[PDB]
Amino acid sequence: IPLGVIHNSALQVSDVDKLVCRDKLSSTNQLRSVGLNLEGNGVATDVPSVTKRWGFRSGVPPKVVNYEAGEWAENCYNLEIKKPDGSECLPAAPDGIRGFPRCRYVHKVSGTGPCAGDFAFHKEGAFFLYDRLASTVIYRGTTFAEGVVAFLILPQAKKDSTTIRYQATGFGTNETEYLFEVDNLTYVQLESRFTPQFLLQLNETIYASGKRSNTTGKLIWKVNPEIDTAFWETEVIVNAQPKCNPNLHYWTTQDEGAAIGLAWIPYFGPAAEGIYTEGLMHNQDGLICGLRQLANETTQALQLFLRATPELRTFSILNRFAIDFLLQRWGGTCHILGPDCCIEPHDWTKNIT
Amino acid sequence: IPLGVIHNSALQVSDVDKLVCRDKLSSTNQLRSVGLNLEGNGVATDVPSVTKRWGFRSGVPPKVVNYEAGEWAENCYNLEIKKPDGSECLPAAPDGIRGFPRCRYVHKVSGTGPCAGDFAFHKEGAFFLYDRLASTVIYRGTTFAEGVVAFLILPQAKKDSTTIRYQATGFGTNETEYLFEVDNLTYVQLESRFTPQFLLQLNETIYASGKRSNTTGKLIWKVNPEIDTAFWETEVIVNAQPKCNPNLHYWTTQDEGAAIGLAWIPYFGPAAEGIYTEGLMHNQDGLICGLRQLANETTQALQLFLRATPELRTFSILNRFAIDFLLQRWGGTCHILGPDCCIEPHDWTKNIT
Amino acid sequence: IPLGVIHNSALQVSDVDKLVCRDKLSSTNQLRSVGLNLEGNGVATDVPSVTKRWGFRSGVPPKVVNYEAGEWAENCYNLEIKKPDGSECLPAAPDGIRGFPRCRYVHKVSGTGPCAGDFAFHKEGAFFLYDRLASTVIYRGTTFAEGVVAFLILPQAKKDSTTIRYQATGFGTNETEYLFEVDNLTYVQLESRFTPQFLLQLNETIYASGKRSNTTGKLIWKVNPEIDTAFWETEVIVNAQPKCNPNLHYWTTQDEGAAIGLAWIPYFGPAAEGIYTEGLMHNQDGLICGLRQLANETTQALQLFLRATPELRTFSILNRFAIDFLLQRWGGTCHILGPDCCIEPHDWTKNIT
Numbered sequence A, B, C: 001i002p003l004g005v006i007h008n009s010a011l012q013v014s015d016v017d018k019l020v021c022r023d024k025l026s027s028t029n030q031l032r033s034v035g036l037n038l039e040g041n042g043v044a045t046d047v048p049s050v051t052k053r054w055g056f057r058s059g060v061p062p063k064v065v066n067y068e069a070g071e072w073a074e075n076c077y078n079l080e081i082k083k084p085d086g087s088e089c090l091p092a093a094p095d096g097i098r099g100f101p102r103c104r105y106v107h108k109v110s111g112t113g114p115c116a117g118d119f120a121f122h123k124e125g126a127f128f129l130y131d132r133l134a135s136t137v138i139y140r141g142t143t144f145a146e147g148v149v150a151f152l153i154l155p156q157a158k159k160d161s162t163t164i165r166y167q168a169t170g171f172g173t174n175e176t177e178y179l180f181e182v183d184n185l186t187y188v189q190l191e192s193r194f195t196p197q198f199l200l201q202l203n204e205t206i207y208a209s210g211k212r213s214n215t216t217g218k219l220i221w222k223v224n225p226e227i228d229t230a231f232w233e234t235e236v237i238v239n240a241q242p243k244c245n246p247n248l249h250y251w252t253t254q255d256e257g258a259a260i261g262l263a264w265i266p267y268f269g270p271a272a273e274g275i276y277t278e279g280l281m282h283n284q285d286g287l288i289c290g291l292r293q294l295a296n297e298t299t300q301a302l303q304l305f306l307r308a309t310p311e312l313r314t315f316s317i318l319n320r321f322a323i324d325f326l327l328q329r330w331g332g333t334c335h336i337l338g339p340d341c342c343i344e345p346h347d348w349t350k351n352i353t
């Protein structure tokens, strides 16, 4: 698992032999795990194109890991897919796995498909980000964000919703048909070019202009091609992605003794949604574009690490880093003045003279 | 999370900047987590007053942590509360969560209430202590003890039931009615002044004097006010609690290779109740009163730490301490003779001379 | 928990006071947990004799630990035992616990017994090895291997199926009757001397010679005593076992970034069975016989460690080792030239002269 460290004002990857003695890890707080969205690299976010990145596969057990800080997503998805015989396709959310906390637009899709498989994975290796838990599968009726997780050592200086409903037929094949749900009886034929802002503006006009359907009669509108329709614009890490959102609007959870006046008490504290801290990080020293690349480059080593462990949810990756960090330099006999012994005796000399 | 360390024969709190080089942590056994009961500070233990410390609240996910050593409790509670429509109020105990192992009096309460909430928390932030697991909620039909957990580094020198049934109506409100269950048809109106020894002595007299009810007819006695009715008497930590039980009768589990003659084998070993070691610690160096205060002062930092993690049961707090302990002193370049480098070279000098 | 370390080309046990400064632990990869089968020591593997090593017991909660590397087993077992009233005896396999990955012969036994107990443990203290998880109980319909787990520090130089069906009556008593299932209606009276190769050769002759039973009529053959019938032949660790299989054909899971050409992606990667690496270790330096003894000598300290923890599945034993390893030498003030300070200053002297 690659580990991000900042040297020469640059984000770099190294763990095994880059024993830079100068690097200081004096607390576990400097260790962070970040879940960056695939949106930041420019992937398409429309429902038709996105669902082609997912597929069902059996014989592979699901794996879950935790991450501390996430990213505000403009798009999220919540699937309620069933088989044509009425059997659900996706498993219910396991205990403690809630939806992604921050989503501008929630694409809730309902429909049918063959579902030739127990679990639905990502065809590109990315994760499904949830509430501080990334999983390799999709859970039924749970809002998720497509993303990947990076791992960082922070320098000691400063260490830190609208629901859109769809209908689907033949989910998960080459021949799928989607319908934008205006209400229970008014539907619009979806296209790959329809943006979220376009679906909502279209929704306001159908409701206001009185173009809703009958009480039972199903009416399916269509939009002709002549109707006109990234989001944020409208070894050294090298970002080789299509685009990069140079700013990171992140979410995390804070802890401190003052607790904003007696709010620790769970009975009086916030709900599952108001526990988060927020911040805006800019691309000073090019960390944001680098970090998005780091999380992509980390995915391959992290997917195999979760394959090999029989643990359902892994929480010990950051602890295992700090242990390895101490074992590399102090795990053997420290030969003073040797390359592998970070002990400095220059202050002492002067007393001998 | 505050960490208790003994300096100048006194229990003290510090972790971040109190790098006392002299302090020796040479094994993980010196790290201990203690669950001290709220009884030790003098809180009232009668069923009517205690149930006002509990309340139902939704939208907050429950959190559980483990502790190694507990405290013998004179009072414990086991709730079997249902809603007036017949729907249970408390969730069933999750896998592996058993009752508190040591209780002199078990207050098993049965009855009804509105239960305006999924889980029932502690209105003061304390935990619900179970079998080496502290939870923030109450489980159905599981004996628990109200307590809090402290964290300690031990010096290297020496590093170490009667069921009372009640009936309730309107559980968890300002207007509740309790009944002391003599048998299935004989009941006594409860008061806040009735002690456990008083309920048992009263029980013996009702049975013996032949004052039991009919075969179906429900009879509810009452005790007039003219009937006369703590338990153990009948930055530096500063105990600011009402009272302090200066002695700690603790329970813990031991491990050693001799195993008392082939008892390790689970098929032949003890049951879930006879695995415990016991001991009696006195207030030498004022550690017991200090420790009860430490566990109270720890509660606030520990409640938020469990809010921020998506882990249902946290077992890694003690490991995370020992990692931080090594990172504070050896996590950077050790400058010999510097304040932050616990390396002593005085023995070597003499050879140079 | 004893820890295996190689000194003077010999496998040795020590952790607490054997602070050999020379020993180097520079990465968590040098830490390994091995699950060795009881076959390697020569225990009988026939179904009748083996089932007498198992027994039911209540009041003892089950415990599970993980191990990294296992051992190819010639014999495994898969029980589907029920009570005479139709109630199952064994609990269903918990989430993520699959069968033992490598088994030459799978003894699938079906039948009835009194099952005077909730869980079935090992009467000798050994574990039930599953897919990188060892448990103290038997799960229903899950293939397991009887084994024990050892713990090792590797030197930095180089750090690394046929189903046989049975029928049973009175399972788990002194009076049990077993039947070798040829098909649903042809059965052979089992004996302790019948080897797996003998049951399969017998199966081929009954099928070929046309000695199968009627369509409903149950026929039970018997083999007279005049019919003639180890497997691999047909403080310092001292192997005091009956036999020792001096070679270890192990299985483990590998992780590396190359991933054999885009196989990390779970949707495209292997199934739950093709994730394993294999290797053959010989008894160079007598490590294999020693290791089998180490895993036996470890069992007693590991069984009590799992009794004391309230954790269902323990994954932190190897991390706890590396933490203790750093705390023993760096957990206190390092007095240069002292016996307990692994710091070498000989290189520096020459500059002073």
Ligand SMILES: *[C@@H]1O[C@H](CO)[C@@H](O[C@@H]2O[C@H](CO)[C@@H](O)[C@H](O)[C@H]2NC(C)=O)[C@H](O)[C@H]1NC(C)=O
Pocket: A123, A124, A125, A126, A148, A240, A241, A242, A296, A299
């Ligand atoms: C990380 O970036 C790479 C860039 O190559 C992404 O690779 C894509 O992989 C799929 C199949 O796996 C191809 O069909 C695409 O053409 C590749 N490029 C792009 C731009 O999509 C990869 O999906 C990214 N995410 C990871 C590895 O999790």
Ligand SMILES: *[C@@H]1O[C@H](CO)[C@@H](O[C@@H]2O[C@H](CO)[C@@H](O)[C@H](O)[C@H]2NC(C)=O)[C@H](O)[C@H]1NC(C)=O
Pocket: B123, B124, B125, B126, B148, B240, B241, B242, B296, B299
């Ligand atoms: C720790 O001790 C404090 C002492 O102030 C306890 O604080 C009580 O808090 C409740 C409301 O939270 C008040 O109504 C009480 O008057 C306070 N004092 C007492 C003596 O009860 C606190 O409950 C204790 N336990 C913790 C913090 O877990």
Ligand SMILES: *[C@@H]1O[C@H](CO)[C@@H](O[C@@H]2O[C@H](CO)[C@@H](O)[C@H](O)[C@H]2NC(C)=O)[C@H](O)[C@H]1NC(C)=O
Pocket: C123, C124, C125, C126, C148, C240, C241, C242, C296, C299
């Ligand atoms: C480890 O080896 C010992 C060798 O003594 C095994 O001990 C057996 O224990 C049972 C009862 O516990 C006795 O009936 C046997 O006679 C003992 N010897 C043999 C050769 O079976 C022990 O079972 C082994 N496994 C462990 C401890 O897990």
Ligand SMILES: *[C@@H]1O[C@H](CO)[C@@H](O)[C@H](O)[C@H]1NC(C)=O
Pocket: A162, A163, A164, A165, A182, A200, A203, A204, A207
């Ligand atoms: C569409 O508009 C109606 C009323 O204006 C509103 O109730 C509904 O939530 C809207 N749908 C979406 C997807 O915004």
Ligand SMILES: *[C@@H]1O[C@H](CO)[C@@H](O)[C@H](O)[C@H]1NC(C)=O
Pocket: B162, B163, B164, B165, B182, B200, B203, B204, B207
């Ligand atoms: C009350 O006394 C009876 C008989 O003396 C006994 O069976 C019962 O358990 C007692 N109840 C309590 C709460 O001690």
Ligand SMILES: *[C@@H]1O[C@H](CO)[C@@H](O)[C@H](O)[C@H]1NC(C)=O
Pocket: C162, C163, C164, C165, C182, C200, C203, C204, C207
């Ligand atoms: C016995 O032989 C038959 C056919 O030869 C085969 O179908 C069956 O699986 C065999 N049984 C075993 C236990 O090998």
